[PDB]
Every structure is written in C-alpha cells, then in structure tokens.
Amino acid sequence: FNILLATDSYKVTHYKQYPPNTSKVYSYFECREYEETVFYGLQYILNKYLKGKVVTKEKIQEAKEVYREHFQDDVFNERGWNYILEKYDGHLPIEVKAVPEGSVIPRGNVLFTVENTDPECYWLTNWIETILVQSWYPITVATNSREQKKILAKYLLETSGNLDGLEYKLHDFGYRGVSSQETAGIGASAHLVNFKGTDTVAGIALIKKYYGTKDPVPGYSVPAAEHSTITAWGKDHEKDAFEHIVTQFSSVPVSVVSDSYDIYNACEKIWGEDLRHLIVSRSTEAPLIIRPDSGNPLDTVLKVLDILGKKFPVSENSKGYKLLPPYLRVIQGDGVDINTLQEIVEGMKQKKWSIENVSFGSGGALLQKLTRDLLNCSFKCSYVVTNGLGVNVFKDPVADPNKRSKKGRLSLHRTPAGTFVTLEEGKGDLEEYGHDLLHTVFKNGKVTKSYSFDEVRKNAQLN
Amino acid sequence: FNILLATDSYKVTHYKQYPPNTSKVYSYFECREYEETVFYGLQYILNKYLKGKVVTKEKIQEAKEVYREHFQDDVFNERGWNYILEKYDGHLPIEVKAVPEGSVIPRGNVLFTVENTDPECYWLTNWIETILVQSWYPITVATNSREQKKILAKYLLETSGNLDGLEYKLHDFGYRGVSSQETAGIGASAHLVNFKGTDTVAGIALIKKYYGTKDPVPGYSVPAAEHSTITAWGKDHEKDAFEHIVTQFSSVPVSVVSDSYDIYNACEKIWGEDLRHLIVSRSTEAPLIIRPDSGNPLDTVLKVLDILGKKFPVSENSKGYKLLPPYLRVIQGDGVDINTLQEIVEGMKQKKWSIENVSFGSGGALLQKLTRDLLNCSFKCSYVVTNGLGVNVFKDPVADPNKRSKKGRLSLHRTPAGTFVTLEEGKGDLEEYGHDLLHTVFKNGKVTKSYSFDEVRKNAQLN
Numbered sequence: 001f002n003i004l005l006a007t008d009s010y011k012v013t014h015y016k017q018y019p020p021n022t023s024k025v026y027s028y029f030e031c032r033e034y035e036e037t038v039f040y041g042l043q044y045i046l047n048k049y050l051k052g053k054v055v056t057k058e059k060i061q062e063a064k065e066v067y068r069e070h071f072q073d074d075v076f077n078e079r080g081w082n083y084i085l086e087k088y089d090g091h092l093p094i095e096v097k098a099v100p101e102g103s104v105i106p107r108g109n110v111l112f113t114v115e116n117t118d119p120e121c122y123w124l125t126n127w128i129e130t131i132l133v134q135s136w137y138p139i140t141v142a143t144n145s146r147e148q149k150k151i152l153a154k155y156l157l158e159t160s161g162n163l164d165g166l167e168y169k170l171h172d173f174g175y176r177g178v179s180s181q182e183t184a185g186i187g188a189s190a191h192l193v194n195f196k197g198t199d200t201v202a203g204i205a206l207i208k209k210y211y212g213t214k215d216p217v218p219g220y221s222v223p224a225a226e227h228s229t230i231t232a233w234g235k236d237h238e239k240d241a242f243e244h245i246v247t248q249f250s251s252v253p254v255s256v257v258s259d260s261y262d263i264y265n266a267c268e269k270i271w272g273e274d275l276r277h278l279i280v281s282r283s284t285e286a287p288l289i290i291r292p293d294s295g296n297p298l299d300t301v302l303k304v305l306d307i308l309g310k311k312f313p314v315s316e317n318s319k320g321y322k323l324l325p326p327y328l329r330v331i332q333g334d335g336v337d338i339n340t341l342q343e344i345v346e347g348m349k350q351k352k353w354s355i356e357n358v359s360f361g362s363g364g365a366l367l368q369k370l371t372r373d374l375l376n377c378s379f380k381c382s383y384v385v386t387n388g389l390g391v392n393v394f395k396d397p398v399a400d401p402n403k404r405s406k407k408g409r410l411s412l413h414r415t416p417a418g419t420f421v422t423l424e425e426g427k428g429d430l431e432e433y434g435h436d437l438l439h440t441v442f443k444n445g446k447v448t449k450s451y452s453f454d455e456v457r458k459n460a461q462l463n
Numbered sequence: 464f465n466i467l468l469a470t471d472s473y474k475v476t477h478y479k480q481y482p483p484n485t486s487k488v489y490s491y492f493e494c495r496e497y498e499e500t501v502f503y504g505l506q507y508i509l510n511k512y513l514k515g516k517v518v519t520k521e522k523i524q525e526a527k528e529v530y531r532e533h534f535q536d537d538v539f540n541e542r543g544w545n546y547i548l549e550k551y552d553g554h555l556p557i558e559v560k561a562v563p564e565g566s567v568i569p570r571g572n573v574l575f576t577v578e579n580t581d582p583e584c585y586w587l588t589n590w591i592e593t594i595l596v597q598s599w600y601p602i603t604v605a606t607n608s609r610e611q612k613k614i615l616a617k618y619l620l621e622t623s624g625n626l627d628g629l630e631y632k633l634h635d636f637g638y639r640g641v642s643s644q645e646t647a648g649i650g651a652s653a654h655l656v657n658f659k660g661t662d663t664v665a666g667i668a669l670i671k672k673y674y675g676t677k678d679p680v681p682g683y684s685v686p687a688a689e690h691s692t693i694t695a696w697g698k699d700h701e702k703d704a705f706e707h708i709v710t711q712f713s714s715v716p717v718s719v720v721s722d723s724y725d726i727y728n729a730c731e732k733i734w735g736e737d738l739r740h741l742i743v744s745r746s747t748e749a750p751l752i753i754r755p756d757s758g759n760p761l762d763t764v765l766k767v768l769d770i771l772g773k774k775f776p777v778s779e780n781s782k783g784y785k786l787l788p789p790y791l792r793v794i795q796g797d798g799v800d801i802n803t804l805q806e807i808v809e810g811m812k813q814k815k816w817s818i819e820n821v822s823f824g825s826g827g828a829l830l831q832k833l834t835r836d837l838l839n840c841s842f843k844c845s846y847v848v849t850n851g852l853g854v855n856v857f858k859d860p861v862a863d864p865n866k867r868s869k870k871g872r873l874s875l876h877r878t879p880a881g882t883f884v885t886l887e888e889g890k891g892d893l894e895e896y897g898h899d900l901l902h903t904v905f906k907n908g909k910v911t912k913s914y915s916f917d918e919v920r921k922n923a924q925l926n
C-alpha cells in the first residue's frame with residue numbers, strides 16, 4: 001500500500017530530533033503491568049506490510065507531495081528513503097526478534113524488539129512503530145478470548161467431568177460488529193487460536209494465507225435462522241418458519257432465533273408442544289440448538305432451561321447437574337462478554353445445569369470493544385547508540401510510574417522455577433539463565449521464521 | 464476481495480428459510496433510541512465493496528469449496544449466485560436509498576434502506592446486511608467526534624468570544640490504537656468530517672479517492688516530538704533535545720512532549736528558564752506546543768498552566784479569561800474522551816483559562832472504543848412481498864421492547880416544526896409531509912449519487 005504513509009504523521013519529522021551521531025535505536029514491545037497475554041499476530045503484519053520490496057521511486061513521490069500538502073512544508077525524509085531504494089532495493093534494514101507465536105507470556109515481559117541494521121537507517125525503527133503496534137489487537141482478541149475459555153473449561157469440567165466440545169462453546173458473531181473488513185478477518189483469526197466456531201469467514205482466508213493449517217479447516221459453523229427468516233412468514237406464523245427451518249436442516253445441527261416475539265411461548269407452546277415432535281425425532285449429531293437474543297443473559301438461560309426441562313426429558317449426569325435430551329440444546333448469542341459469561345455459568349450451576357446444555361456467542365464484546373489499554377500494550381525505545389557507545393533509555397513520568405520503561409538490551413528468559421523473566425541492561429549476555437527465547441523473525445526485508453497456525457494453537461493452550 | 468464471503472456464515476444458509484414464493488426482501492438501517500447522528504460512510508463501503516461487477520465464475524467457485532469445509536456440506540447458493548453473473552454480468556442487483564452523506568438526523572429515524580432488485584435475488588437484500596452494517600463505525604466516530612466539537616465550541620465561545628480555531632482543537636492520535644490499517648483509514652476520515660487535524664495520513668487517501676475535497680488541506684499536522692526523540696539524548700539531556708527541536712522547527716508550530724521525566728521541571732525550569740529565550744523569540748504563526756502525556760488529565764492542564772503563567776507574560780481578555788503569550792500553547796493528548804474532555808474545559812473555566820490556550824488530542828477513545836451499541840445501530844427487515852401481496856414485518860420482543868422494529872416501507876420526511884420523522888407502513892405514500900429525503904444511491908451495481916467530502920462536512924457542520 002505505502003509504508004511511507006503507514007505511520008503517525010508527526011514521525012515523518014522525527015528523523016531530525018534524534019541526538020546527532022546516533023547510529024542505533026533499538027525499540028521493544030510489551031504489555032505493561034489479564035496477567036498473561038497470548039502473543040499472536042505479529043507474523044501477519046510482517047508478511048502483509050513489511051516483508052519484501054516496499055519502497056519505490058513512485059511511493060517516495062506519493063509520500064512527499066502528500067507529506068507536503070499535509071505539513072504545508074517539505075520535511076519528509078526523501079533523502080534517507082532512497083538510500084533504502086538505491087541500496088537494499090526497497091527492503092527495510094531492520095531486525096525483529098519476537099517470541100514463538102501463540103506463546104502465553106505473563107506481564108511486564110518483552111515480546112518483541114526492533115532495531116535498525118544500517119546506521120543510516122537509525123530513523124526507521126520507530127517509523128514502523130505504528131503499523132507494528134496494531135498487534136495490541138490480534139493479541140487482545142486472543143488473550144481476552146482465551147480467558148473466557150478457562151472460565152468455560154472449569155465450569156464444564158466441574159459440571160460434566162470433561163472438556164468434551166469445549167472448543168466450540170464460544171461462537172464469534174463479530175463480523176457485523178467490527179469497524180473494518182480487514183479487521184473482522186484479523187480478529188476472527190484471534191478466536192480460532194482458541195475456539196473453532198466462527199461466522200466471520202474472513203478469519204480463515206487470513207489463517208491459511210499467513211499461517212497455514214494442515215488440519216481439516218480452522219473454523220466452522222452451522223445453519224441458523226436470523227430475525228428476518230422468521231418474521232418474513234408473518235406475525236402469526238412463527239411456528240410455520242420454526243417448522244420450515246427444522247425439516248430443511250433436518251439434515252445437520254441447526255440454530256433458530258426464538259425471541260422474535262416472546263421467547264417463552266416459542267419455547268413452551270411452539271417447541272414444547274406443537275413442534276415437540278419434529279424434534280425428539282432428531283439425532284444427537286443434528287441437535288436443534290435454540291437461540292435467545294432477549295434481556296439479561298442469566299435470567300433468560302435459566303428460565304428457557306426451566307421451560308425445556310418441563311417440556312422435555314431431563315436427565316442428570318454423574319455430577320448431579322441436569323442435562324437435556326441429546327437432541328436439544330441452547331446458545332446465548334447476545335449479551336455475552338467475559339464479565340457476563342462467568343455470571344451465567346455460575347448461575348447455571350447453582351441451579352445445577354450442566355454447562356453443556358449451553359454454548360455461547362459474543363458479538364462486538366469479542367471482536368470490538370477491545371483497547372490497547374486493556375493490556376497496556378506499549379512500544380518504547382530501550383537502547384540507542386550515540387557516537388559509537390550505547391546508552392540505556394526509558395521514560396519515567398513522575399505523575400506516573402508503571403509507565404517506567406525497561407532499560408537497554410532486553411532478553412526474555414525462562415526461570416528455573418517455571419515462568420519467564422525479561423533481562424535488562426544487556427544483562428542477558430551473562431548466560432545466567434541461558435538462551436534468550438525471542439527469535440529473529442525478520443531481518444532485512446525477509447521473513448526468517450514463521451509458525452503454522454497449528455503451532456500457534458499448541459503454544460497458546462491451557463496446559 | 465470476494466463478496467461471497469463478506470457475510471455471516473449462517474446467512475449462506477438463509478435462502479432456504481424464507482416463506483416460499485417470496486420475491487421482495489426490503490430492509491432498513493437505523494440508530495434505535497448521543498441523540499442525533501451523523502450519517503457518514505455508506506458511500507465508501509457502498510463503493511469499494513458493493514459497486515461494479517462483483518460476482519464471477521471463480522468467486523463462485525472459491526466461495527464454493529470454502530462454504531463446504533466450513534459447513535461440512537454444500538448449501539451455498541451456487542445456483543442463485545450464477546443468476547446474478549449470467550444475468551447481470553456480476554452486478555449485485557439491489558437498490559439502496561440513503562440520506563445525504565453527512566446528514567445529522569435524530570434517533571429512531573430511517574437512515575438507509577435496501578431491497579433486492581429482481582424477484583430472483585430476494586435473498587440478496589440481507590446477505591449484505593453485514594457489509595452494510597460495518598458502517599455504524601464511520602457514523603459513530605463522526606458522531607462522537609462531532610459532539611466533542613460542541614463541547615469545545617461552547618467553552619471557546621464562552622471564554623474567548625468566537626469559534627476561532629475550533630476545526631483544530633481535537634487532534635486524531637488514533638493510528639496506533641485502532642484494530643487494523645483499513646480501520647484507521649475509515650476512522651480518521653470520520654473525524655475530519657468534523658475537525659481538520661490528523662496524524663493519520665491513511666484517512667486522507669480514503670477521502671480523496673472516495674469523496675474528494677476541493678480543499679488543499681483536508682487534514683493537517685505539524686512536527687512533534689515523541690518519547691524516543693527525547694530520551695535518546697539521555698536521562699540528563701532532556702533539554703538539549705528540547706532546544707534541538709525548537710531550533711530545527713523554528714518556523715512552524717512544534718509540539719514537544721514534556722513528561723519523559725517530571726513534566727513540571729520541564730515546564731518550570733527547562734521551558735521557563737533554561738530555554739525560555741528560544742521561546743519568546745517565536746512568531747504566533749508558529750508557537751511552541753507543550754504536550755503533557757501522563758497524570759490526571761485535568762489536575763495536569765491546570766498546574767501546567769499555573770506553572771507557565773508564572774514563567775510567561777499572561778494577558779486577560781474581554782470575557783475575563785486569561786490567555787498566555789501568542790508564541791506558547793498546550794496540547795493535551797492522552798486520557799481524552801468525550802466525558803473527560805468536558806471535565807477539562809469546565810474545570811479550566813472556573814479557574815479562568817480560555818479554551819484557546821489548550822487544544823486536545825485523543826487516540827483510542829477517538830478511533831477505537833466505539834461500539835455498535837452506542838446509537839444501537841441496527842439493520843432490520845420491515846417489508847417483504849410473499850405470494851404477490853407483501854407484508855409489513857417487524858420484531859417485538861418482551862425482554863427489550865425497545866428492540867421493536869418498524870413496519871412496512873419507510874420514508875424520511877421533514878416536519879413543519881423543523882425536524883425529521885420516519886413514516887412507516889408505506890404510509891409516506893399519502894404524500895403529505897413532502898418528499899422522502901432519502902435519495903437513491905446504488906440501483907443495480909452502479910453508484911447513482913455520491914457526495915464530495917465538502918458537502919458532507921457542510922451537512923454535519925454545526926449549529
């Protein structure tokens with residue numbers, strides 16, 4: 001597209017504020033003290049934006065002329081950009097050290113770094129700060145999404161004895177809830193790192209093009225109804241659609257919006273009586289998944305379940321929690337976020353309902369309403385070479401610590417007792433902990449190391 | 464970009480759920496009952512995505528094998544999709560009416576509608592409910608942004624006497640707080656509808672290529688300093704940079720972050736003493752912008768000012784509010800949102816400072832941190848022709864009776880008192896409120912009406 005304008009405008013200017021005789025600026029990324037993040041997504045932005053030849057006689061021309069109308073002034077580093085076109089044929093001379101994608105590393109720890117390879121390109125490092133920082137996203141989607149799984153995991157386990165079907169308990173509805181198209185895709189791929197069910201198709205295009213999966217396919221879905229494929233039959237024909245949709249999909253599992261008009265009549269009257277037969281006559285492989293989109297995730301699940309307990313044969317597992325007949329289940333697809341999720345399963349089990357009769361779906365809570373601040377994703381410079389000798393750097397606002405930056409050449413190590421540790425001031429060169437863990441993944445325009453979305457899983461997974 | 468996969472998965476199933484003999488699926492967009500939104504963005508989505516020839520022998524085949532391993536079955540409409548290609552040369556056939564881009568309409572009114580073009584593609588209307596709904600974004604950024612302008616407008620006028628400098632008092636710093644690249648593009652462009660300052664160049668591209676400006680500066684910015692261009696000088700050389708930066712950009716406004724280390728020493732001794740002479744010796748056409756970025760956003764602006772008032776020559780004015788010298792101002796970018804913003808100017812007023820000294824900068828809150836939930840952006844079906852007569856549709860839960868739905872064909876009119884009103888039940892037809900303010904903007908694959916970002920701005924203009 002144009003890296004020359006994939007940066008925060010005021011940077012086009014930074015190349016003239018660095019102390020003079022500076023040959024190296026080394027920057028690092030992190031999630032400043034959710035206490036362990038899933039580092040996923042850097043490998044996308046790299047291939048799709050940095051790798052390869054990225055500077056051209058034409059882009060240097062587009063940039064200025066633009067960063068000219070913009071600034072009402074010629075400040076753009078047109079000189080130092082051709083250096084890059086003339087010498088490395090438009091390949092950025094920067095090294096990028098990161099952690100294996102999917103890695104679940106605690107907070108305040110180094111995840112990736114950026115330093116320039118050529119002393120004439122000292123200005124480049126931070127130029128790419130921006131584009132590279134938008135990882136706070138794939139990461140937060142993944143992290144926050146993975147935290148809901150633990151919640152799901154421990155409630156299923158305690159209420160059922162196992163994790164059967166865990167990976168299909170949170171369904172991403174995000175697509176219409178996101179801002180871009182390019183984004184719905186990136187975020188859908190940050191759920192699949194954890195679950196397999198997704199309606200955002202764009203999510204997979206990404207996976208198999210930037211990460212690759214050897215498996216059958218990264219995500220899936222089933223046929224369901226929406227509000228129009230039901231209200232289009234008429235006010236007084238909810239039952240006609242209900243029925244026309246579960247003979248069509250007699251076939252496989254099928255989800256049907258049951259809250260067009262009162263979702264207790266649809267449950268009791270229509271499913272528990274009229275149509276009670278086009279259902280018990282279904283298979284455990286093709287359940288009739290029921291879908292409320294009402295008011296109050298908790299209050300509703302509990303009641304709908306109460307309606308269904310009364311209209312169908314309820315059983316009870318070796319744990320004491322009630323279960324529905326294998327051909328009937330429920331999904332909360334509206335009003336579900338990490339905070340409310342916990343509320344539901346906890347209420348479900350005080351009532352004694354296997355966390356299994358119910359799966360969920362989250363919209364924008366899952367794909368939008370995520371911020372860089374949620375995890376303090378930050379990108380700062382920790383080391384610079386001025387006149388040949390290096391000096392550790394950082395910031396320390398008085399009106400606020402925690403903003404305090406790490407100093408010098410950082411290293412990410414594995415403590416003899418389990419976790420990690422980021423070593424500062426180049427102290428990692430004394431093999432006390434042995435073997436930095438961040439790998440080079442980018443060096444002078446080429447992607448020196450990628451991971452398949454299969455490893456990404458493995459890495460970011462619950463034990 | 465294939466649009467056969469720019470829809471929710473389950474929607475692919477949808478063509479088998481409508482009441483048989485359905486020929487018309489007419490749907491509308493709205494912001495169910497921030498209380499008068501700015502309608503912006505449709506013209507992009509509806510042009511970079513739905514426009515021209517969008518279906519093909521291949522796109523039909525690609526979306527085929529995918530909606531196959533995705534669904535573990537073929538229920539994709541390879542039949543119906545080949546109509547649109549073999550019949551209209553891959554031109555999505557649908558008619559979409561909208562309101563003048565930039566239009567500021569109260570809530571609960573129809574903003575746009577979509578109804579298939581031909582009896583065959585009745586299913587199409589909704590298919591695109593997705594693509595067409597990720598517009599809530601361009602709208603809310605524009606809406607949120609616009610409000611903040613009123614808050615700035617009201618305190619400027621009250622404290623300075625005029626609206627001099629409004630268009631430049633809220634600077635977009637979002638670029639790195641947004642999900643993807645395409646997001647900051649779409650988003651920044653939505654801030655400009657309201658203001659003019661942006662660090663996000665990506666946004667401009669979108670404007671010229673999709674709306675066009677006759678203006679020279681659709682977006683504008685000045686050279687600033689970030690945390691590395693200052694710390695690289697060294698813990699004890701914060702000041703050589705301050706002065707290396709106020710000399711490099713001696714004849715243009717320039718902003719210099721001052722919270723690297725204690726942002727009061729910077730203001731007090733460093734700017735007020737050590738480098739004070741490079742300051743009073745600057746034109747008003749290019750002042751020094753001091754930029755805090757840490758601490759309580761209000762307590763800080765107030766002390767920073769109290770600190771500068773003590774170092775520099777402060778005047779008073781016709782309204783009785785104090786102003787500092789022409790060559791010195793403040794930019795407050797950080798912890799700034801619509802809520803916080805107001806806490807700053809009212810607090811600045813009781814202390815008597817004048818919104819002219821200060822200008823703000825928002826990043827995440829400005830571009831990210833917006834939800835489809837504010838404004839309750841919802842796209843629903845209200846009319847459908849089944850078996851020749853067509854019925855007025857709508858949903859009406861009983862858990863959220865706010866989630867009702869309009870019935871029949873809608874129309875937007877202007878009331879004799881001066882506001883708007885959506886007439887439903889095809890009722891706007893008893894012509895008697897004037898004409899539908901909704902123009903046709905898409906009929907059969909071609910864009911029948913675009914607007915220049917100049918009209919847009921002007922519609923969303925204030926008061």
Ligand SMILES: O=C(/C=C/c1ccc[n+]([C@@H]2O[C@H](CO)[C@@H](O)[C@H]2O)c1)NCCCCC1CCN(C(=O)c2ccccc2)CC1
Nearest residue numbers: 173199222224255329330333334356357358359363471473
């Ligand atoms: O329900 C949907 C999609 C709903 C949808 C899709 C797109 C958009 N929307 C709506 O957008 C909004 C965003 O705010 C909502 O109101 C959201 O639901 C709704 N797809 C079918 C998902 C079910 C796939 C099942 C396959 C197998 N499966 C089960 O057999 C199961 C097992 C145990 C418990 C529950 C289910 C678990 C999941």
Ligand SMILES: O=C(/C=C/c1ccc[n+]([C@@H]2O[C@H](CO)[C@@H](O)[C@H]2O)c1)NCCCCC1CCN(C(=O)c2ccccc2)CC1
Nearest residue numbers: 008010631636662687718756792793796819820821822826
């Ligand atoms: O300060 C910046 C850019 C800051 C920036 C840019 C990109 C990213 N960031 C960082 O994003 C993060 C999110 O937390 C932050 O740490 C943030 O500081 C900060 N550019 C200089 C802006 C000067 C704009 C002025 C031009 C002219 N102007 C004035 O002369 C003026 C008039 C009255 C009052 C004040 C100023 C009004 C606006």
